[PDB]
Amino acid sequence: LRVPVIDLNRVSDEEQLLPVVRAILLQHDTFLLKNYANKAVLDALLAGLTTKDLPDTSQGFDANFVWLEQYIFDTDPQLRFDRKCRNESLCSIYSRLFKLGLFFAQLCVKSVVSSAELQDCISTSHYATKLTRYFNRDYVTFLPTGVLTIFPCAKAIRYKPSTMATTDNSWVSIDEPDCLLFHTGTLLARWSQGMHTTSPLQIDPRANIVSLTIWPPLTTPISSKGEGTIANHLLEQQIKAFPKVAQQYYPRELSILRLQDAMKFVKELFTVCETVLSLNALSRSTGVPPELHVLLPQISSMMKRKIVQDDILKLLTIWSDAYVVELNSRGELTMNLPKRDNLTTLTNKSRTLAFVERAESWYQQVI
Amino acid sequence: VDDVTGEKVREAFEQFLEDFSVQSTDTGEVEKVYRAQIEFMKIYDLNTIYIDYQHLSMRENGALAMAISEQYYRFLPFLQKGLRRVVRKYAPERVFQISFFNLPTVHRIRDIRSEKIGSLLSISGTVTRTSEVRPELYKASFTCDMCRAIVDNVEQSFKYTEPTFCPNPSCENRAFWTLNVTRSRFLDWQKVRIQENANEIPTGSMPRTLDVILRGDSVERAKPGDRCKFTGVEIVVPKISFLACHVISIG
């Protein structure tokens, strides 16, 4: 609820706010911008509604079914990128929000190691924006694909369970009237020394999420950890990997060569499953015979996603030497611990690292 | 006089439990099922066994059953120690409950005299009221005034007791030890109301009711307002109450 509120009538000369903005992103990384001159162009979002005439092929509107036209707006002078829709009122708000984005870029990416490379949208004009028009269960967690993204919205906030801002692992939501929300991408979280976060999005009352990203170059030299993988290819793989793709050959090839890396939703099961069986070991001097009907809602309450026997079968397929698959006389699957002690945290850390290494070897040999 | 008789009756009870295995294939000869019953409860560790009195009445021409039958409260820790020794030798947080059932004689509530105090009895009737289960202190962990030493004190089902001497000769005081609940096993304790059946009431008499206590896992089985038959020990309460170990829904 504590969001920083600033005025816009005195930051027009750009000489009093840079230090404060740099200081304020150490704890709060969702910015709110008010009182601009867009009080008569912002309510003119009723022009681009019913076009529906061209296919996707990674440019323009991915028109998926009368309910969604996601315009992945490509840039104009870069190679392999050419996209021009009508969008007159959206061109006016794109010009004002792009000047607002370059204004925020010049006032906040100057406090890092490079203050001329990250704003390289001024020269080559590298922009691939997300005009997600939800016109007349929802989509996955969307972080901004650029390095800085300012957007008009209704509420625009949620929180997935992880170690990030508002760390209480619950979906938090605040409502904001007549303003803009700023969120930065993941490449600026690696550029700045760990001061950013992520934020999930969904169907808001102002459903047209016009995400205008900065979108760094095709050949921008990122440091040592990302020298081989450019910003364009990695973020384009993320752009083509989150929604459904059924138009052409290459992003479907990227989806069948990249969506089999979903071991993090099952190997994290291995970061918590032994804990609960050990919790059953320090409380039931019954020799720990477990029942599937009592171990299933325990891990289903520990993890919000669906947990059924396919994960148990996948864990049996990847690591069979640490568990049993022996059935009893009644007809159900039983599984116990082969350790003679209750649990040792060093051996548990070694077993978790060996499970991670075995799944990584399976990911290397499956492709 | 029962200090040397208790070890002999403990040896007789463990010989009864040790000499009888299972040879019950093809409905041939009979032998008792107790070792497989202990082997079945090894996984679940409830230890709330059921021993038939009709199956115990064949040894020593019934004389072992008649001697246990009158001195049941004086022979009960020897019986549980013999049961503990046979499960300690046949198998590797320890509570025990020995229940007796199927008596050949059914006694009413009007034929209870003071000659059967401490003996076992079969009481049949109807349940009038029930009391919600509450923890029974059973045994507590007392700490000393200066030693801070743990003492495992065994209650005698009468009232809040207190030790007399500290075992460690670091002190010999008799002041107030303090109670401790960590190392003190607790058993659910219920108190229900049994009353005389409508078909065996005398002419002009009143259907006299009585309160019966119950522990172990014999609680939460007796349904209210149903004819019930209990098997237990007559224990006095400072009033003549009862302790049941077996519950059944007769009628």
Curated annotation (Swiss-Prot), chain A:
Transmembrane segments: none
GO biological processes: cell division; double-strand break repair via break-induced replication; pre-replicative complex assembly involved in nuclear cell cycle DNA replication; regulation of DNA-templated DNA replication initiation
Flavoprotein found in the keyword field: no
Compartments in which it is found: Cytoplasm; Nucleus
Keyword presence, Cytoplasm: yes
Recorded family membership: Belongs to the Cdt1 family.
Subunit-structure text: Associates with the MCM2-7 complex. Interacts with MCM2, ORC1, ORC2 and ORC6.
Extra remark: Present with 2190 molecules/cell in log phase SD medium.
Identification of the protein by name: Cell division cycle protein CDT1
Segment of the intact protein contained: 13 to 415 of 604
UniProtKB/Swiss-Prot annotation, chain B:
Name assigned to this protein: DNA replication licensing factor MCM6
Gene name in the database record: MCM6
Compartments it resides in: Nucleus
Subunit and interaction comment: Component of the MCM2-7 complex. The complex forms a toroidal hexameric ring with the proposed subunit order MCM2-MCM6-MCM4-MCM7-MCM3-MCM5; loaded onto DNA, forms a head-head double hexamer. Interacts with MCM10.
Domain of life of the organism encoding this protein: Eukaryota
Function recorded in the entry: Acts as a component of the MCM2-7 complex (MCM complex) which is the putative replicative helicase essential for 'once per cell cycle' DNA replication initiation and elongation in eukaryotic cells. The active ATPase sites in the MCM2-7 ring are formed through the interaction surfaces of two neighboring subunits such that a critical structure of a conserved arginine finger motif is provided in trans relative to the ATP-binding site of the Walker A box of the adjacent subunit. The six ATPase active sites, however, are likely to contribute differentially to the complex helicase activity.
Residues where Phosphoserine is found: 205
Taxonomic placement: Eukaryota, Fungi, Dikarya, Ascomycota, Saccharomycotina
Note: Present with 13400 molecules/cell in log phase SD medium.
